[PDB]
């Protein structure tokens, strides 16, 4: 091992764990908690950013002084990744957008950027690399999202034969835009769902389980090469998802059956918005399509991670969206939805 790299201290803010993290796109939900755990135990974290440094300031109070270093970086410019990943031990890829922008397409951020980050990291000579791809990554999937993850996973697998690809099923949390999605749905009158959402079962997993699983994969000496899939502890129908979360918000649930094409159209008008889109046609397919089960792929329990139940952590997000009439209502009042778990 490197001479000035041996772990030291009792896993604190000022301790030394020996991990030179290089999380990319940490200015997001997964990045926010990943740098938190890395900073918490004590590890040098190199965070490249593309957006305004002001938005990245909320990661400043996340580690000891000189442990978090912010670096400018660009996806297209190869030299940008080289500077970030040169003095590194683990480079983990968290870059990727749920929608499409004019400069960066779906394949650009999910295949091209992962292709660049994997090739440079291997060429630089980092010992480990972790890549994030959707658990539903499928080449024939109707959504360009999941197709891009599949080919992107294939590319980083070939370029980096020791990369530990991560397969989260459906992430949820405070700023998760997954249950915040259905929570924000009450604004547009009722709750539009395709065929009332009775033919879609998902298995969401909360942030800390996948987040802790990341560093556990970093600490795991045998995690290289594997394709761990981080999945939740329970499976519920899509109708049960909206039923439960609206109940925790106590907002009046108004089920609204929709044809598939009308919902596809609705994403089109909402994609026109020059600002950040609310609903996209790709998001239409993702919420419509159902989560798949991959028992052969190792799960999250193999890394000593217990999948937190959705009902236990759903209140942490639903409190913000609920009204004053039930703001102080607890979580025992609501009852977890019908689990159709495997």
């Amino acid at each position: 091992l490197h001479h000035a790299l041996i772990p030291h201290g009792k896993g604190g803010r000022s301790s030394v764990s020996g991990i030179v993290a290089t999380v990319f796109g940490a200015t997001g939900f997964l990045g926010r908690y990943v740098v938190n755990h890395l900073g918490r135990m004590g590890s040098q974290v190199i965070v490249p950013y593309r957006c305004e440094p002001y938005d990245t300031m909320h990661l400043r109070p996340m580690g000891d002084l000189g442990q978090i270093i912010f670096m400018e970086w660009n996806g297209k410019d190869k030299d940008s990744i080289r500077k970030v990943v040169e003095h590194s031990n683990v480079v983990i890829n968290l870059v990727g957008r749920e929608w499409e922008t004019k400069n960066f397409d779906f394949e650009d951020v999910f295949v091209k950027i992962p292709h660049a980050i994997a090739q440079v990291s291997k060429e630089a000579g980092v010992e480990k690399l972790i890549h994030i791809s959707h658990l539903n990554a499928d080449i024939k999937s109707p959504s360009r999202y999941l197709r891009s993850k599949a080919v992107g996973e294939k590319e980083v697998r070939a370029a980096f034969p020791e990369a530990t690809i991560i397969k989260p099923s459906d992430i949820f949390g405070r700023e998760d835009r997954f249950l915040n999605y259905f929570a924000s749905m009450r604004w547009f009158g009722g709750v539009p769902l395709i065929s009332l959402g009775k033919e879609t079962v998902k298995q969401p997993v909360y942030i800390v389980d996948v987040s802790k699983g990341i560093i556990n994969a970093i600490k795991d000496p045998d995690a290289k090469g594997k394709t761990f899939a981080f999945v939740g502890p329970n499976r519920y129908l899509l109708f049960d998802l909206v039923q439960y979360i609206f109940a925790v918000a106590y907002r009046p649930f108004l089920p609204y059956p929709l044809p598939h094409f009308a919902y596809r159209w609705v994403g089109r008008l909402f994609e026109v918005s020059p600002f950040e889109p609310w609903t996209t046609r790709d998001k239409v397919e993702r919420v419509h399509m159902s989560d798949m089960t991959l028992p052969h792929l190792p799960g999250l329990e193999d890394l000593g991670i217990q999948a937190t139940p959705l009902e236990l952590k759903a209140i942490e997000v639903l409190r913000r969206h609920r009204t004053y009439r039930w703001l102080t209502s607890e979580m025992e009042d609501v009852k977890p939805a019908k689990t159709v778990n495997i």
Binding site: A4, H8, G9, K10, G12, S14, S15, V16, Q44, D64, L65, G66, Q67
Partner: protein, 129 residues
């Protein structure tokens, strides 16, 4: 000695539950006491008159950004003053600290005879003063 509803609670004092130092720092801390030894280049034996309480030196790692000796044990610089050793151990029992006792290394009472520096047969005579 002052009879005010006195009850014979003669069990060893256990103030650890009240002072509430963390579990790692009440069991896994060998508290040791001695009398400090006088610095040899000094001639200051008066500093060897007090019983002193110490701890065990834990990990002292170097800071990445500068190189420091960041410590994780709060009881690193803590030393305590005791007139006699029985008071020092008495504090250890009430604070339930695993105690170790050394003894006061009193100096030998050496006999100095300057007249012996110039003898007729004894080897103690000095070749140069």
């Amino acid at each position: 000695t002052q009879d005010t509803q006195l009850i014979a609670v003669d069990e060893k004092l256990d103030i650890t539950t009240l002072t509430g130092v963390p579990e790692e720092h009440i069991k896994t801390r060998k508290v040791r006491i001695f009398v400090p030894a006088r610095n040899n280049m000094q001639s200051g034996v008066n500093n060897t008159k007090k019983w002193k309480m110490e701890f065990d030196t834990r990990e002292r790692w170097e800071n990445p950004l500068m190189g420091w000796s960041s410590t994780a044990d709060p009881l690193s610089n803590l030393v305590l003053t005791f007139s006699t050793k029985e008071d020092a151990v008495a504090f250890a029992e009430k604070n339930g600290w695993s105690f170790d006792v050394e003894e006061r290394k009193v100096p030998k009472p050496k006999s100095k005879s300057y007249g012996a520096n110039f003898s007729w047969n004894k080897r103690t005579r000095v070749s140069t003063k």
